[PDB]
Design a protein around this motif. Structure first.
Motif, PDB file in Angstrom:
ATOM      1  N   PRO A   5       0.811  -1.221   0.000  1.00 29.14           N
ATOM      2  CA  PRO A   5       0.000   0.000   0.000  1.00 29.14           C
ATOM      3  C   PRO A   5       0.851   1.280   0.000  1.00 29.14           C
ATOM      4  N   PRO A   6       0.272   2.405  -0.454  1.00 31.39           N
ATOM      5  CA  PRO A   6       1.001   3.655  -0.389  1.00 31.39           C
ATOM      6  C   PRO A   6       1.490   3.925   1.017  1.00 31.39           C
ATOM      7  N   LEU A   7       2.731   4.383   1.128  1.00 28.51           N
ATOM      8  CA  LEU A   7       3.335   4.682   2.432  1.00 28.51           C
ATOM      9  C   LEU A   7       3.757   3.434   3.227  1.00 28.51           C
ATOM     10  N   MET A   8       3.675   2.263   2.614  1.00 27.14           N
ATOM     11  CA  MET A   8       4.444   1.133   3.132  1.00 27.14           C
ATOM     12  C   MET A   8       5.632   0.955   2.208  1.00 27.14           C
ATOM     13  N   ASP A  32      11.152   5.139  10.425  1.00 24.80           N
ATOM     14  CA  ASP A  32       9.776   5.385  10.826  1.00 24.80           C
ATOM     15  C   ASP A  32       8.860   4.204  10.492  1.00 24.80           C
ATOM     16  N   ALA A  33       7.625   4.331  10.942  1.00 24.52           N
ATOM     17  CA  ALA A  33       6.576   3.378  10.684  1.00 24.52           C
ATOM     18  C   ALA A  33       6.381   3.182   9.186  1.00 24.52           C
ATOM     19  N   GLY A  34       5.935   1.991   8.811  1.00 28.62           N
ATOM     20  CA  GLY A  34       5.567   1.717   7.457  1.00 28.62           C
ATOM     21  C   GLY A  34       6.560   0.841   6.733  1.00 28.62           C
ATOM     22  N   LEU A  35       7.755   0.703   7.285  1.00 31.24           N
ATOM     23  CA  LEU A  35       8.711  -0.277   6.770  1.00 31.24           C
ATOM     24  C   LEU A  35       8.216  -1.699   6.963  1.00 31.24           C
ATOM     25  N   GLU A  54       0.719   5.920  19.099  1.00 29.90           N
ATOM     26  CA  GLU A  54       0.981   6.903  20.136  1.00 29.90           C
ATOM     27  C   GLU A  54       0.057   6.642  21.321  1.00 29.90           C
ATOM     28  N   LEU A 164      -2.872  -3.185   7.587  1.00 29.29           N
ATOM     29  CA  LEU A 164      -3.111  -1.760   7.522  1.00 29.29           C
ATOM     30  C   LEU A 164      -4.597  -1.450   7.692  1.00 29.29           C
ATOM     31  N   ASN A 168      -5.684   0.839  10.865  1.00 31.52           N
ATOM     32  CA  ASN A 168      -6.430   2.111  10.681  1.00 31.52           C
ATOM     33  C   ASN A 168      -7.742   2.113  11.491  1.00 31.52           C
ATOM     34  N   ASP A 171      -6.962   2.691  15.118  1.00 27.27           N
ATOM     35  CA  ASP A 171      -6.661   4.107  15.309  1.00 27.27           C
ATOM     36  C   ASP A 171      -7.919   4.963  15.359  1.00 27.27           C
TER      37      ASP A 171
ATOM     38  N   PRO B   6      -2.018   6.751  10.915  1.00 25.21           N
ATOM     39  CA  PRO B   6      -1.055   5.688  11.120  1.00 25.21           C
ATOM     40  C   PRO B   6      -0.112   5.576   9.942  1.00 25.21           C
ATOM     41  N   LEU B   7       1.170   5.398  10.231  1.00 33.00           N
ATOM     42  CA  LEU B   7       2.194   5.278   9.187  1.00 33.00           C
ATOM     43  C   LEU B   7       2.563   6.614   8.518  1.00 33.00           C
ATOM     44  N   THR B   9       4.612  10.023   9.765  1.00 33.45           N
ATOM     45  CA  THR B   9       5.553  10.330  10.811  1.00 33.45           C
ATOM     46  C   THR B   9       5.772  11.810  10.726  1.00 33.45           C
ATOM     47  N   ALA B  33       8.709   6.824   2.396  1.00 32.24           N
ATOM     48  CA  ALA B  33       7.454   7.523   2.288  1.00 32.24           C
ATOM     49  C   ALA B  33       6.772   7.621   3.646  1.00 32.24           C
ATOM     50  N   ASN B 168      -4.405   7.394  -1.731  1.00 35.90           N
ATOM     51  CA  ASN B 168      -4.882   5.987  -1.742  1.00 35.90           C
ATOM     52  C   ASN B 168      -5.850   5.733  -2.915  1.00 35.90           C
TER      53      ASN B 168
END
Ligand SMILES: [Ca+2]
Ligand SMILES: [Ca+2]
Ligand SMILES: [Ca+2]
Lengths: 230, 230
Positions: A5-8, A32-35, A54, A164, A168, A171, B6-7, B9, B33, B168
């Motif tokens: 997905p975008p941002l992973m 950061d997150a998403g790796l 958080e 994801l 989401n 969250d 989420p994801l 930063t 990203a 997305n």
């Protein structure tokens, strides 16, 4: 080609690197997150996600059940419908009732009250059985259980996508729905269980996914923080 | 506290750093990203997003209009309904018809055929007018235009959230809908325009958001790659 997905961000593990270890190493370095670190062989799939919710650690532990639901949904989208996936409270995976991989979790802290700088969830899934005589908890392997038409790359992509989706929703405050999804998949609920040197009936879980273990005279609460990889 | 999806930063810019420059610097260093670098003052809001769409540069340029739509939606969610936002093809922003900030775009390559390793979109938005005598294209500022109840932190959060929504959808193949949203906000469509040393009527855009500029005898195509910050 493995598409996330975008941002992973996908990163294949190199020489000397394994996904869960590497993701934790990178997280401590400030990635950061998403790796999504991954390593595919013919016989095994490994992957790990870097997250940064958080909230205090106590509450961040929900990422384990969340990614378990993600996995069950991901495999169900690709496998024959007769293949049953169940989730152990401790992160172990079961396919058609047999131990077949696990989800692991680590974080930047072990204080339940502290908000962690990072959290990593790792997937280890055997695809064919390793018969070399190395010690293993696994009783089967994915391709031994009727999933020969499931491609490892597609399963990885699908895990990431379904994780994801649920992260989401978590969250956005949908913990209650997550609890329900997870309870339906939980292995051994209502049955005998030994955990953290205590025995009883696995009654259910509290709001932070701590195990309620009822023995003859008392109910133990085993917080999910106990399964953190040290 | 600035809360991102989420994801994503958030990183506040430090001494010697500005968001668009820093995001580009970090992107070239390999930061993935989802980074949002920001810098808030009483008089200005700056922010920048690191992206990595897996398409050729020609097609990745859609991130500019996408983040423009994101901004229009973000401001509309927070501002009085009489405040009109329009988007210039080149990334300039207009509030109630007046130039009031801009979106900028950079990428790892300038070859339209190459898939970039990274792309960054930056927002610069004046909140109060700078009257110090520094050269500026801006004709107004946000809080001069009836948006005094819009908090900069909330606007930043909202921009990030609405950009992610549209990115997305773009990823899921909804380019046509994006085109429609953007066309409704476009500044000066159907009107006279000078661009890249050519003049004519701004007729519309092609599928890659290249400007169609019609003069007396011909139609020029100005690819959106021309607005890349060099
Ligand atoms: Ca390895
Ligand atoms: Ca600065
Ligand atoms: Ca990231």
């Amino acid at each position: 080609t493995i598409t996330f997905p975008p941002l992973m961000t996908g990163e294949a593990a190199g020489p000397g690197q394994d996904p869960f270890d590497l993701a934790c190493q990178k997280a401590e370095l400030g990635v950061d997150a998403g790796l999504v670190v991954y390593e595919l062989g013919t016989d095994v799939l490994r992957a790990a996600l870097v997250l940064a919710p958080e909230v205090p650690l106590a509450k961040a532990m929900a990422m384990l059940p969340v990614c378990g639901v993600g996995f069950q949904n991901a495999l169900g989208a690709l496998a024959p419908p007769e293949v049953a996936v169940h989730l152990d409270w401790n992160g172990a995976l079961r396919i058609n009732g047999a131990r077949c991989g696990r989800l692991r979790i680590a974080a930047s802290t072990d204080d339940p009250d502290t908000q962690p700088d990072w959290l990593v969830v790792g997937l280890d899934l055997p695809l064919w059985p390793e018969g070399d005589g190395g010690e293993t908890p696994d009783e089967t392997a994915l391709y031994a259980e009727g999933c020969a038409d499931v491609a490892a790359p597609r399963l990885l992509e699908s895990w990431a996508r379904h994780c994801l989706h649920w992260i989401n929703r978590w969250d956005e405050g949908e913990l209650e729905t997550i609890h329900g999804e997870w309870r339906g998949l939980a292995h051994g609920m209502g049955e005998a269980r030994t955990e953290a040197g205590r025995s009883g009936t696995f009654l259910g879980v509290d709001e932070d996914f701590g195990m309620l273990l009822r023995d003859e005279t008392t109910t133990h609460l085993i917080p999910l923080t106990t399964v953190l990889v040290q």
